[PDB]
Amino acid sequence: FVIRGNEVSQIAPGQTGNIADYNYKLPDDFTGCVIAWNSNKLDSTVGGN
């Protein structure tokens, strides 16, 4: 998906938050990885994406 950069703390394994409760809940025992990189080059517009 595409999210805000500062919201990574909200997608921590077993984290609780408004997006973590109503958008995408990661499991408390998540056994994997997360790779995040800036997408302002393609997923951002001057008029507001």
Partner: protein, 50 residues
């Protein structure tokens, strides 16, 4: 008359009952945890830290 004639059995009873009392006191203990009731920990703390 004498209060120490039955000392051994009274000591046994005291030891057992007070071991149980020590247990229930451990129930009201922390061991570094915030509180002594699990429901309180769940209510005040988020599940990742609870």
């Amino acid at each position: 008359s004498t209060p120490s004639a039955l000392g051994k059995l009274q000591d046994v009873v005291n030891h057992n009952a007070q071991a149980l009392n020590t247990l229930v006191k451990q129930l009201s203990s922390k061991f570094g945890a915030i509180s002594s009731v699990l429901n309180d920990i769940l209510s005040r703390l988020d599940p990742p830290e609870a």
